A paper describes a structure:
The adaptor protein, speckle-type BTB/POZ protein (SPOP), recruits substrates to the cullin-3-subclass of E3 ligase for selective protein ubiquitylation. SPOP recruits substrates via its N-terminal MATH domain, whereas a central BTB domain mediates dimerization and interactions with Cul3. Here, we show that MyD88 interacts with SPOP through a long degron that contains the established SPOP-binding consensus and an N-terminal site that we name the Q-motif. We determine the structural basis of these interactions and show that the Q-motif interacts with an unexplored binding pocket on the SPOP MATH domain.
Numbering used by the authors:
A (entry chain A): 26 to 166
B (entry chain D): 428 to 442
Write the structure that this text describes.
Amino acid sequence: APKVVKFSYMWTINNFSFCREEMGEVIKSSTFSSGANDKLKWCLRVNPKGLDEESKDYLSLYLLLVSCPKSEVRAKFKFSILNAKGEETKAMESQRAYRFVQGKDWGFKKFIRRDFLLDEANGLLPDDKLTLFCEVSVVQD
Amino acid sequence: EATQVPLVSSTSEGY
Protein backbone atom coordinates (compact mmCIF):
# COMPACT_ATOMS: atom_id res chain seq x y z
CA ALA A 1 0.00 0.00 0.00
CA PRO A 2 1.64 3.33 -1.08
CA LYS A 3 2.08 5.83 1.74
CA VAL A 4 1.26 9.41 0.74
CA VAL A 5 2.15 12.68 2.45
CA LYS A 6 0.20 15.65 1.04
CA PHE A 7 0.89 19.33 1.68
CA SER A 8 0.08 22.56 -0.06
CA TYR A 9 1.40 26.06 -0.52
CA MET A 10 -0.09 29.39 -1.64
CA TRP A 11 2.26 31.78 -3.41
CA THR A 12 1.26 35.39 -4.02
CA ILE A 13 3.56 37.13 -6.48
CA ASN A 14 3.14 40.86 -5.90
CA ASN A 15 3.97 43.59 -8.41
CA PHE A 16 3.54 41.13 -11.25
CA SER A 17 3.75 43.93 -13.84
CA PHE A 18 7.32 44.63 -12.64
CA CYS A 19 8.57 41.30 -13.92
CA ARG A 20 11.36 41.99 -16.38
CA GLU A 21 10.74 42.41 -20.09
CA GLU A 22 14.07 40.82 -21.01
CA MET A 23 14.31 37.03 -21.18
CA GLY A 24 15.81 34.91 -18.43
CA GLU A 25 14.13 36.07 -15.22
CA VAL A 26 13.44 33.35 -12.66
CA ILE A 27 11.34 34.16 -9.61
CA LYS A 28 11.17 31.70 -6.69
CA SER A 29 8.90 31.33 -3.67
CA SER A 30 9.91 30.90 -0.07
CA THR A 31 10.63 27.32 0.87
CA PHE A 32 7.91 25.07 2.27
CA SER A 33 7.55 21.51 3.54
CA SER A 34 5.17 19.03 5.02
CA GLY A 35 4.53 19.08 8.74
CA ALA A 36 6.70 15.94 8.96
CA ASN A 37 10.32 16.09 10.19
CA ASP A 38 11.44 14.82 6.78
CA LYS A 39 14.15 17.44 6.11
CA LEU A 40 12.65 18.12 2.69
CA LYS A 41 12.49 21.75 1.56
CA TRP A 42 10.60 22.70 -1.60
CA CYS A 43 9.93 25.87 -3.54
CA LEU A 44 8.12 27.04 -6.66
CA ARG A 45 9.86 28.72 -9.58
CA VAL A 46 8.33 30.82 -12.37
CA ASN A 47 9.80 32.17 -15.58
CA PRO A 48 7.34 35.00 -16.44
CA LYS A 49 8.53 34.97 -20.06
CA GLY A 50 9.32 31.29 -20.45
CA LEU A 51 12.41 29.17 -20.45
CA ASP A 52 13.32 29.47 -24.16
CA GLU A 53 11.99 30.79 -27.47
CA GLU A 54 9.53 27.91 -27.76
CA SER A 55 7.92 29.02 -24.47
CA LYS A 56 8.37 32.80 -24.83
CA ASP A 57 4.57 33.24 -24.99
CA TYR A 58 4.07 31.48 -21.64
CA LEU A 59 4.73 31.52 -17.97
CA SER A 60 6.75 28.45 -17.01
CA LEU A 61 6.05 26.98 -13.57
CA TYR A 62 8.00 24.28 -11.74
CA LEU A 63 8.23 22.57 -8.33
CA LEU A 64 11.86 22.44 -7.09
CA LEU A 65 13.19 20.12 -4.40
CA VAL A 66 15.62 22.60 -2.83
CA SER A 67 16.99 20.44 0.02
CA CYS A 68 16.87 16.66 0.53
CA PRO A 69 19.15 14.26 2.44
CA LYS A 70 17.79 11.20 0.62
CA SER A 71 18.78 9.92 -2.80
CA GLU A 72 15.27 10.46 -4.20
CA VAL A 73 11.71 11.45 -3.39
CA ARG A 74 8.81 10.56 -5.68
CA ALA A 75 5.94 13.03 -5.80
CA LYS A 76 2.84 14.02 -7.73
CA PHE A 77 2.00 17.71 -7.93
CA LYS A 78 -0.75 20.06 -9.04
CA PHE A 79 -0.68 23.81 -9.75
CA SER A 80 -3.61 26.24 -10.01
CA ILE A 81 -4.24 29.95 -10.43
CA LEU A 82 -6.71 31.61 -8.09
CA ASN A 83 -8.80 34.28 -9.75
CA ALA A 84 -10.15 37.48 -8.21
CA LYS A 85 -13.09 35.57 -6.68
CA GLY A 86 -10.78 32.91 -5.15
CA GLU A 87 -11.81 30.28 -7.69
CA GLU A 88 -9.66 27.58 -9.26
CA THR A 89 -8.54 28.42 -12.74
CA LYS A 90 -6.43 26.60 -15.27
CA ALA A 91 -5.15 23.97 -12.85
CA MET A 92 -3.02 21.14 -14.15
CA GLU A 93 -1.66 18.04 -12.43
CA SER A 94 1.29 15.73 -13.12
CA GLN A 95 -0.90 12.57 -13.13
CA ARG A 96 2.09 10.36 -12.37
CA ALA A 97 4.72 10.81 -9.69
CA TYR A 98 8.07 12.18 -10.77
CA ARG A 99 11.50 11.41 -9.34
CA PHE A 100 12.98 14.39 -7.45
CA VAL A 101 16.51 14.70 -6.14
CA GLN A 102 18.03 17.72 -4.43
CA GLY A 103 18.27 20.48 -7.05
CA LYS A 104 15.75 18.85 -9.44
CA ASP A 105 12.51 20.43 -10.58
CA TRP A 106 9.47 19.22 -12.52
CA GLY A 107 6.57 21.20 -13.93
CA PHE A 108 5.02 22.83 -17.00
CA LYS A 109 7.11 24.87 -19.43
CA LYS A 110 3.87 26.13 -21.00
CA PHE A 111 1.82 26.53 -17.87
CA ILE A 112 -0.29 29.48 -19.02
CA ARG A 113 -0.18 31.83 -21.98
CA ARG A 114 0.80 35.36 -21.02
CA ASP A 115 -1.91 36.74 -23.32
CA PHE A 116 -4.52 34.90 -21.24
CA LEU A 117 -2.91 35.85 -17.95
CA LEU A 118 -2.64 39.56 -18.81
CA ASP A 119 -6.22 39.85 -20.19
CA GLU A 120 -8.08 41.63 -17.38
CA ALA A 121 -11.33 39.92 -18.36
CA ASN A 122 -9.94 36.71 -16.87
CA GLY A 123 -9.48 38.28 -13.41
CA LEU A 124 -6.11 36.60 -12.75
CA LEU A 125 -3.99 39.64 -11.73
CA PRO A 126 -6.14 41.56 -9.24
CA ASP A 127 -4.19 44.47 -7.77
CA ASP A 128 -1.19 43.37 -9.85
CA LYS A 129 -0.87 40.10 -7.86
CA LEU A 130 -0.66 36.56 -9.22
CA THR A 131 -1.82 33.90 -6.75
CA LEU A 132 -0.63 30.34 -7.36
CA PHE A 133 -1.64 27.25 -5.41
CA CYS A 134 0.41 24.05 -5.32
CA GLU A 135 -0.49 20.67 -3.82
CA VAL A 136 2.34 18.13 -3.48
CA SER A 137 1.77 14.41 -2.87
CA VAL A 138 4.98 12.61 -1.77
CA VAL A 139 4.77 8.86 -2.38
CA GLN A 140 6.76 6.63 -0.02
CA ASP A 141 7.28 2.89 0.37
CA GLU B 1 -1.76 28.68 -29.57
CA ALA B 2 -2.93 26.45 -26.73
CA THR B 3 -3.65 28.36 -23.52
CA GLN B 4 -1.99 25.66 -21.40
CA VAL B 5 -0.02 22.53 -22.32
CA PRO B 6 -0.43 19.70 -19.74
CA LEU B 7 2.92 18.01 -20.52
CA VAL B 8 5.53 17.73 -17.77
CA SER B 9 9.20 18.60 -18.08
CA SER B 10 12.24 19.68 -16.08
CA THR B 11 14.67 22.55 -16.41
CA SER B 12 17.54 20.03 -16.22
CA GLU B 13 18.40 16.73 -17.86
CA GLY B 14 18.85 13.73 -15.57
CA TYR B 15 19.36 13.58 -11.83
